[PDB]
Amino acid sequence: QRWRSDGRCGPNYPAPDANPGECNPHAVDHCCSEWGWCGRETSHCTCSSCVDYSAGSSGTCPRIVSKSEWGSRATNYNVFLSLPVPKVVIHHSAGATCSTQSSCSLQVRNIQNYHMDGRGYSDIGYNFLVGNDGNVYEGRGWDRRGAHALNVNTESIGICFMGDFTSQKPTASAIAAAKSLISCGVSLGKIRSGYSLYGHRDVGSTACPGNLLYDDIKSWGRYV
Ligand SMILES: [Zn+2]
């Protein structure tokens, strides 16, 4: 990857997939200092030759497409989650995949219409969605109680990958976007650092989030 395993970085310690060697954006030590160490302190982040990998397109926080950007309909749901959140539940759409911001935005619009008009929800059920386009889309957000898993709605953030992943896996960009979303939520204090990661099937009776995606999330950090 773009950072080393020994904790070094910079133009003197090249990474396997990166020269100069970089730092894990989602790690506590995400700044490459003068002395070629990945560190966390202000000195590591604010020197003239220092690089803070928390920031940028590859930072901890992924670009979240807001409700107004993906074309959400008017909602007025204000049932708030107790923050920070103990656990993260992973979902799959069990539906269409999407590869562009337009098609994924349309897909989110469809899912919202299904939840509100077909099932009678106050809004789209999930807190966030993720498309194969590598983007994150805003559902009920960080602060509002979701409707994605009955046993755990009040204690969790629901992230739903858009697609069916029983025999497929999402694009690497989708996975990266979800992980970065989680990391971001942790950095903000929306999600506890000692959070627990669940698949939907772990907390309910479904095949969600599909076999292969469920297999992949075991390798993610903090899976229960
Ligand atoms: Zn689910």
Author numbering: 3 to 226
Quote from the publication.
PGNs are normally recognized, and/or hydrolyzed (amidases EC 3.5.1.28) in some cases, by a class of PRRs, termed peptidoglycan recognition proteins (PGRPs). The catalytic PGRPs possess the amidase activity that hydrolyzes the amide bond between the MurNAc and L-alanine moieties of PGN, via a coordinated Zn2+ ion. The full-length BbtPGRP3 consists of an N-terminal signal peptide (Met1−Ala18), followed by a CBD (Gln19−Tyr71) and a C-terminal PGRP domain (Thr90−Gly255), which are connected via an 18-residue linker from residues Ser72 to Gly89. All together, the modular evolution via gene horizontal transfer and domain shuffling results in a unique domain organization of BbtPGRP3, which has a higher amidase activity and a broader spectrum against invading bacteria.
Here we report the crystal structure of BbtPGRP3 at 2.7 Å resolution, showing an N-terminal hevein-like CBD followed by a classic PGRP domain at the C-terminus. Each asymmetric unit of the crystal contains one molecule of BbtPGRP3 (covering residues Gln19−Gly74 and Ser87−Gly254). It is composed of an N-terminal CBD (Gln19−Tyr71) and a C-terminal PGRP domain (Thr90−Val254) connected by a truncated linker (Ser72−Gly74, Ser87−Gly89). Notably, truncation of the linker from 18 to 6 residues did not lead to significant change of the amidase activity; thus only the wild-type BbtPGRP3 was applied to all following activity assays and comparisons. The CBD starts with a long N-terminal loop (Gln19−Glu40), followed by the core structure of a three-stranded antiparallel β-sheet (β1~3) and a helix α1. The CBD of BbtPGRP3 adopts an overall structure remarkably similar to the well-characterized U. dioica UDA. Besides, the four disulfide bridges (Cys27-Cys50, Cys41-Cys56, Cys49-Cys63, and Cys65-Cys68) that stabilize the BbtPGRP3 CBD also resemble the counterparts in UDA. All the four putative chitin-binding residues of the CBD of BbtPGRP3 could be superimposed to those in the structure of UDA complexed with a trisaccharide. At the center of the solvent-exposed valley, a zinc ion is tetrahedrally coordinated by the nitrogen atoms of residues His121, His230, the sulfur atom of Cys238, and a water molecule Wat1. Wat1 is further stabilized by the Oη atoms of the catalytic residue Tyr156, which have been proposed to facilitate a water-mediated nucleophilic attack on the lactyl-amide bond and stabilize the reaction intermediate, respectively.
